[PDB]
Amino acid sequence: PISKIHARSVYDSRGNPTVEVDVVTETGLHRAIVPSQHEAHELRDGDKTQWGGKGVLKAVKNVNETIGPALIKENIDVKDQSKVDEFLNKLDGTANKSNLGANAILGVSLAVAKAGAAEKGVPLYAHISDLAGTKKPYVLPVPFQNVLNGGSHAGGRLAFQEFMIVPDSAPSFSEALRQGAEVYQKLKALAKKKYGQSAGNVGDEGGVAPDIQTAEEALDLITEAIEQAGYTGKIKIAMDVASSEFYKADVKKYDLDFKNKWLTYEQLADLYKSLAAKYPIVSIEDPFAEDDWEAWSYFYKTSDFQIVGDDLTVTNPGRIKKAIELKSCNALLLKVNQIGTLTESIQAAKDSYADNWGVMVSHRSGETEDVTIADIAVGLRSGQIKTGAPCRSERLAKLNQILRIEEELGENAVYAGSKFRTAVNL
Amino acid sequence: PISKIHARSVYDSRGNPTVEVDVVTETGLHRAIVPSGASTGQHEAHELRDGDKTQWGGKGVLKAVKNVNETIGPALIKENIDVKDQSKVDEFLNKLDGTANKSNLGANAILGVSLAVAKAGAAEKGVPLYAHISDLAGTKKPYVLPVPFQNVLNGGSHAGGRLAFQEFMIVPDSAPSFSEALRQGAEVYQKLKALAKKKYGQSAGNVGDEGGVAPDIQTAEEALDLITEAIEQAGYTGKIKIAMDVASSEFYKADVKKYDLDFKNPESDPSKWLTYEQLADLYKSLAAKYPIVSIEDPFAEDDWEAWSYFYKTSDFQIVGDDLTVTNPGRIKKAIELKSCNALLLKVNQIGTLTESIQAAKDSYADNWGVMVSHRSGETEDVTIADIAVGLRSGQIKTGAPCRSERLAKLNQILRIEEELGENAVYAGSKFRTAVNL
Ligand SMILES: O=C(O)[C@@H](CO)OP(=O)(O)O
Ligand SMILES: O=C(O)[C@@H](CO)OP(=O)(O)O
Ligand SMILES: [Mg+2]
Ligand SMILES: [Mg+2]
């Protein structure tokens, strides 16, 4: 039985409060931290005198005073994650988890999952593999590393949000990490040399954000850095456009200079096609806005690369079903706190796998020292993880955790490599 | 009886390899990760790097990891030392290395075993690490939670820009608790970040190695005005003080005995280079104008004359970092010459927990303050949080409230604070003397 459930406020990587939950069982303490339009509703305090309104005292209170005591009295076996998460949603009673807070619910859900793994005597990724029905051997994910940032994070005209390197040709996860780390060091030096010493400072996810004007300008910098590291042809490129940030819905046009020409979705698709034929771009996330379903489907029809829903799908089985039915995208960016329980997150992955989607387990821009998503990526056999540049330990702690899993599993794990889109069946 | 000692390579917060060590006992797995500095002093214990320029730009730690797995690990298991006898362990680790600067097996190889064994020793006692370190250091109860010195504006070798001084810190010492001090600093930091973007552009909001904003500014006066304005916007003027880590060894021109406040720009202007007297005048002017309560490395690592000259006139905290390199022999010299009145304690500058504790005890003996410190290359490891509490130092330096290699330490003290309740007190305004609080 659970002997203790207790939450507290801790700080995420941006300096904002977030929820940490302890679940104590006979196997010890099991801890999880929650990261930070159609997303599950996180509960913030809204006291403008406290953390600028971003406190989580009410969500922590909901764990300590409401969820905790109820779950203990309900006396659910901690291995039965589905039953735990069903009970959590029953307690909340709202579709968007706005009664108790999605951050309150997820914190309990993730901490109980670790208690369940411990009860089974297996690490969390093995437990998640059981919960998700993924086969052996385990698949280690290709890291999609956001080394250069634009859009809302940068000061140049560059509208696209994230430029990533993809070390998919490496024989092992460990070698892929070394490759990406070496490329990143080259890029940081290039950014400082070509744009000034201030260009080496990093944004929220550990990448640089110089004053870049065009997408080709950013891709050439990455291309140059891959070459200096000696990995041209061994490392691919991915993008997170976050096009919702510059979609003018009234005119159905996209503003590539939204921080200072506007493109229809057909013209923006032409630009992606031109970039994808010139650069080794194997994955594009949110190329069109979160409700611009016609644009996604138009783009899906012609594209042989990965098309990742983020704001489009918000880890939400209802939005995934729509995207499957309308053939809008072929991969899911899985953010557990967008849906708010581990079971619903696993279902979202399962629903994506059923349509032969790739699944890229993802961090949030506000991360913590928590490494749960590393185990989630391995347990889901997703073969892809998006958890930042190789910089800032809220990003690297996830990578370090996969290094530990890699070493622990030895031959019972294989690197997804170039098959990351289909790694669940690799 | 240790059942297993195993090291691996992991990545620190700058993306460089470092050593992580597992020690497995009856109580389970105990793990520690070694940090890595950027503005490293010449006298620090020797960090063993691979130097293979085709791998991590030469910064691999495979050789250090091998030393743990092949040499240190098996020798420590066979020696069968009780894991809670930290002194005997660190005595044995140093005997194995046999050199003064730990250049044989590597200070990063040695420290990882030292800290992982320390967590094993704490667990055999059934107490948290901070309580075990309090036993080892002989520090009294109740526990003292440290004032977080928060480097919210980065300069020097930690960030890109024209700012010579390395670190500008806020010091929430008036707060009634550690938890409230953290909220105050977090609120100031958010005001500062928005203010830096407004006055210097969106790029000024990007952060340096330790999570502080790095606006392209020239003088310390500009950095201090920005922090002052942020403190006022957050409503904490008079409640939060300011500290600096000049890291002046980075811009000391040793041959001419001058200090270059524009060392980032090849624009020499050697007439703008300052003698230590002129640099001391600058510190005095800043300390009389701003609420500066602590200045770290105001003069170079072997400019003992400058330190002593400054110490004589200064009532604020003067912190040795590169001067003392957490080294009892250098601390003795600084005591004898009256060079500084506080130790910046970096465990990986000396390479074992026991020597680090000795460095703190030697400092306390001269009524020094002790500020437990991160390195600029940090990890998800939180050991220094338990060290700061265990040593009753009352001050910690572990970053801006930004980037989780910094916040993980602060979060760990939040957990200690909640765990201890009334059995702990916030050092507050008495951080310089917290060991005797
Ligand atoms: O857009 C994304 O993929 C991530 C950031 O990488 O989302 P968020 O910023 O909302 O956490
Ligand atoms: O100079 C310092 O005080 C430290 C921590 O801020 O930096 P580094 O680890 O690079 O020496
Ligand atoms: Mg996105
Ligand atoms: Mg220093």
Helix (H) or strand (E) holding B277: helix B276-289
Residue A127 in contact with residue A82, Cβ under 8 Å? Answer: no
CB burial readout A83-114, b (16+ within 10 A) else e: ebbebbbebbeeeebeebbbbbbbbbbbbbbb
- From the number of C-beta atoms within 10 Å of its C-beta (0-12, 13-18, 19+), residue A75 rates as exposed
Distance CA A259, CA B136 (A): 57
Report how far residue A413's alpha carbon sits from residue A171's, in angstroms, rounded to the nearest whole number. 12
Q: Tell me the resolution in Å.
A: 1.9
Closest atom of ligand 1 to CA, residue A285: 3
Tell me the backbone φ, ψ of residue A200, rounded to 5 degrees. Answer: -85, -10
Q: Which residues contact A179 (CB under 8 A, 6 or more apart)?
A: A167, A170, A229, A231, A234, A235
The answer to whether the beta carbons of residues B297 and B246 sit under 8 Å apart is yes
Angstrom distances, CA of residue A76 to CA of A87, A97, A116, B90: 9, 21, 11, 46
User: How far does residue B247's CA lie from ligand 4's centre (Å)?
Assistant: 5
β-strand partners of B371: B344
What DSSP designation does B418 have? H
Give residue A44's identity as a one-letter amino acid code: R
Q: What is the radius of gyration, based on Cα positions, of chain A?
A: 21
Q: Find out whether B44 and B132 touch, Cβ atoms under 8 Å.
A: no
**DSSP conformational letter for B245:** E
Nearest CA in chain B to A229: B54
Per-residue tokens: B265: 């720009």
Distance CA A127, CA A113 (A): 8
Strand, helix or coil at B214?
Answer: coil
Chain A CB contacts of B408 under 8 Å are 368-369, 393
Chain A environment of B411 (Cβ under 8 Å):
10-11, 20, 368-369
Mutate to test the pocket of ligand 2, among B152, B207, B250, B346 (most ligand atoms within 8 A of CB): B346
The closest of B20, B7, B11, B108 to A174, measured between CA atoms, is B11
The answer to whether the CB atoms of B13 and A393 lie below 8 A apart is yes
What backbone phi and psi angles, to 5 degrees, belong to A252? 55, 45
- A 10 A CB-CB count for A280 gives 17
Residue type, B104: N
To the question of whether residue A153 is assigned a binding role by annotation, the answer is yes
Active centre residues of A (catalytic): 205, 335
Closest CA to B395 of B426, B419, B416: B426
Integer CA distances (angstroms), B424 to B144, B382, B409, in order? 6, 19, 17
Cα A382 from Cα A424, distance rounded (Å): 6
Ligand nearest to the CA of residue A286, numbered in listed order: 3
Q: How many angstroms does the Cα of residue B397 sit away from the middle of ligand 1?
A: 30
Question: Considering CB atoms only, which of A8, A52, A404 is closest to B190?
Answer: A52
Task: Check CB contact of B399 with chain A, cutoff 8 Å.
Answer: no
Chain B, residues 187-216, CB within 8 A of chain A, namely 187, 189-190, 201-204, 206-208, 214, 216
Q: Ligand 2 mean position to B39 CA, how many Å?
A: 6
Instruction: Decide: B26 and B83 in contact? Cβ < 8 Å.
Output: no
Identify all chain B residues contacting A396, using CB atoms and an 8 Å cutoff.
10-13, 15, 379-380
Best mutation target, A12, A188, A201, to test chain B (most B CBs within 10 A): A201
Scan for tokens 């005048």, then name that residue. Answer: B281
Helix or strand run (H / E) with residue B395: strand B395-397
CB A53 within 8 A of CB A16: no
Residue ranges of the domains in chain B?
1-126, 127-437
Q: After which residues is chain B broken (C to N over 2.5 A)?
A: none
B-proximal residues of A, 337-376, CB under 8 Å: 367-369, 371
Q: Are strands B28-33 and B292-296 parallel, antiparallel or unpaired?
A: unpaired
Decide if B369 contacts B395 (C-beta within 8 A): yes
The region that residue A129 occupies, defined by phi over 0 for left and psi between -120 and 50 for alpha, beta otherwise, is alpha
Q: Determine the 3-state secondary structure of B4 from DSSP.
A: strand
Sign of the torsion formed by the C-alpha atoms of B202, B230, B415 and B142: positive
Strand partners, A20: A8, A33
B172 at A interface, C-beta within 8 A: no
Task: Tell me, letter by letter, the H, E, C secondary structure of chain A.
Answer: CCCEEEEEEEECCCCCEEEEEEEEECCEEEEEECCCCCCCCCCCCCCCCCHHHCCCHHHHHHHHHHHHHHHHHHCCCCCCHHHHHHHHHHHHCCCCCCCCCHHHHHHHHHHHHHHHHHHHCCCHHHHHHHHHCCCCCEEECEECEEEEECHHHCCCCCCCCEEEEECCCCCCHHHHHHHHHHHHHHHHHHHHHHHCHHHHCECCCCCECCCCCCHHHHHHHHHHHHHHCCCCCCCEEEEECCHHHHEECCCCEECCCCCCCCECHHHHHHHHHHHHHHCCEEEEECCCCCCCHHHHHHHHCCCCCEEEECCCCCCCHHHHHHHHHCCCCCEEEECHHHCCCHHHHHHHHHHHHHCCCEEEEECCCCCCCCCHHHHHHHHCCCCEEECCCCCCHHHHHHHHHHHHHHHHHHHHEEECHHHHHHHHHC
Q: Is the separation of the CB atoms in A213 and A198 below 8 Å?
A: no
Instruction: Work out the minimum CA distance from B13 to partner chain A, whole angstroms.
Output: 4
Work out the minimum CA distance from B427 to partner chain A, whole angstroms.
20
Residue B95 burial (10 A CB sphere; 0-12, 13-18, 19+): exposed
Q: What phi and psi values does residue B19 have, to the nearest 5 degrees? A: -95, 130
Q: Give the rounded distance of the alpha carbon of B302 from its chain centre.
A: 19
A142 CB burial (10 A radius; 0-12, 13-18, 19+): buried
Cβ contacts of A301 within 8 Å, gap of 6 or more: A327
Residue A14's beta-bridge partner residues?
A: none
Q: Is residue A364 within 8 Å of A335, Cβ to Cβ?
A: yes
Residue A386 labeled ligand binder: yes
| Alpha-carbon Rg for chain B in angstroms | 21
d(CA B26, CA B29): 9
Residue linked to tokens 């009664």: A99
CA-closest candidate to residue A289, choices A246, A328, A335: A246
Whole-Å CA distances, A304 to A215, A329, B110, B133, B275: 20, 11, 51, 58, 65
Tokens of B306: 């400058």
Beta pairing, strands A358-362 & B424-426: unpaired
Q: What are the b/e assignments for B281-294, b being 16+ CB within 10 Å?
A: ebbeebbeebbbbb
Q: Decide if A284 contacts A278 (C-beta within 8 A).
A: no
Angle between helices B178-200 and B220-233 (to 10 degrees): 120
Cα end-to-end distance, chain B, whole Å? 38
First to last CA, chain A: 38
The two tokens of residue B288 are 């009389």
- What is the distance between the alpha carbons of residues A87 and B69, in angstroms, rounded to a whole number? 46
Q: Is the peptide bond before B328 cis (omega within 30 degrees of 0)?
A: no
Q: State how far the Cα of A234 lies from the Cα of A212, in Å rounded to an integer.
A: 25
Ligand 2 pocket: which of B12, B34, B36, B39 to mutate (most atoms within 8 A of CB): B39
Q: Phi and psi at residue B427, in whole multiples of 5°?
A: -60, -35
